Amino acid sequence: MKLSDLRPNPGANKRRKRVGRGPGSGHGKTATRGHKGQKSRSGGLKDPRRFEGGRSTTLMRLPKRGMQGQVPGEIKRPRYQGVNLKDLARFEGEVTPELLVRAGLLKKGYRLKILGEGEAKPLKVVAHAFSKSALEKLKAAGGEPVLLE
Amino acid sequence: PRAKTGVVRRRKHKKILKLAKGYWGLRSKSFRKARETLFAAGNYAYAHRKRRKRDFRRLWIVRINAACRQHGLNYSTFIHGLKKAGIEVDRKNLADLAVREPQVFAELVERAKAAQ
């Protein structure tokens, strides 16, 4: 195979749309913008995601809800990410938070809490928390729940 | 990289100007006036092909008529008669006959008078 035989697949590199380039292009004169108005101008309209022509916006007529919090901001507390038993089936022997960090199941600086979707496998799993059903299933399946603080 | 106009535009104007050869004043000399003249010439052309088919038929008709009234009837009666007879020689050909072959045309006249 040689250099001249290198090709993108059909569809992989598509040509751009060029407006304002003659009658026959189908994009001439107004450059697909229509006639006059704010939208046709360089600069265009206000952020259509929010603005509605001056009347109170949809978003701003809805009521706020709940704690937003105050300066000095967030209150540092321990955080829990759950991982299911089904996610644990791939391992053997012992599973601990750091292992499930490596396997890319649990995110760093998060505390492990085992949840109950899936089956239980007779492992010695070490966490900071278990759900009621995960506790039963895992105790029932010959595994060994181990609690950290 | 920069792509100046360079050679391309001149070649587009020339294409047009050549097409405009023969037109009066700036119409063969200025690129802009040629293009205006050529839009007209193009719609005139298209239309006149259509119109030419009519124009000739109207001449064929006038001609058939003169050679019909030499035998005592009009085009309208003539065309009726040929129609009843089942003679399907077109007006283009009837006309050549009416001038080039007047005996043969007189015969056609005969049949049309018979057919009604």
Binding site: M1, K2, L3, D5, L6, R7, P8, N9, A12 | -
Partner: protein
């Protein structure tokens, strides 16, 4: 999988290794495109109407002169003004996925193998830096130079010998790359090189 010729004084033996058999023409393109694009310099520049030398004065009044209204002569509409949306410096580089590069490297070699064009050599006889020495050795291995060769070895003196040739491109094995593979009609690798090519693909 693939059967690769190996040159020795003990003869033309054969070597066995597993390079992918079905080769992806789009994937090799995506590697080369990337290789060649990140090498770009991005040093084309132009000046906007604010970067141009003239002043901001309104050349003549808005109304009543009988001329077109203009502001300053930095406007792109003036000959001598700034250019609209011209290039500024640009970085054409981007991070092609590592696994993609790896497959591309595998397939590139595999392609030349399927072609019967891949050749592994044990050593390089008497070539000790002089080009005419390489040419000797070349002949002994079938390299007249009717076919362009990518020579991959860690032996500097071999590279320095073979380098000035029109039909030879030279690489240390850590420099193996698919644009260089595709460019050339024949692949010639020291065993030492083939080992490190092996490490990079597994």
């Amino acid at each position: 999988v693939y059967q690769i010729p190996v040159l020795s004084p003990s003869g033309r033996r054969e070597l066995a290794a597993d390079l992918p058999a079905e080769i992806n023409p789009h994937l090799l393109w995506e590697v080369v495109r990337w290789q060649l694009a990140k090498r770009r310099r991005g040093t084309a520049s132009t000046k906007t109407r604010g970067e141009v030398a003239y002043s901001g004065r309104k050349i003549w009044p808005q109304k009543h002169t009988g001329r077109a209204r203009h502001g300053d002569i930095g406007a792109p509409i003036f000959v001598g003004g700034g250019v609209v949306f011209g290039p500024k410096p640009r970085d054409y580089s981007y991070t092609l996925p590592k696994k993609v590069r790896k497959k591309g490297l595998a397939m590139a070699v595999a392609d030349r193998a399927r072609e019967g064009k891949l050749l592994l050599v044990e050593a390089f006889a008497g070539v000790n830096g002089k080009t005419k020495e390489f040419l000797a050795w070349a002949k002994e291995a079938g390299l007249d130079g009717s076919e362009s060769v990518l020579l991959v070895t860690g032996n500097e003196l071999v590279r320095r010998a073979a380098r000035n040739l029109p039909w030879v491109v030279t690489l240390a094995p850590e420099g193996l790359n698919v644009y260089d593979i595709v460019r050339t009609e024949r692949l010639v690798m020291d065993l030492d090189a083939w080992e490190v090519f092996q490490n990079r693909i597994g």
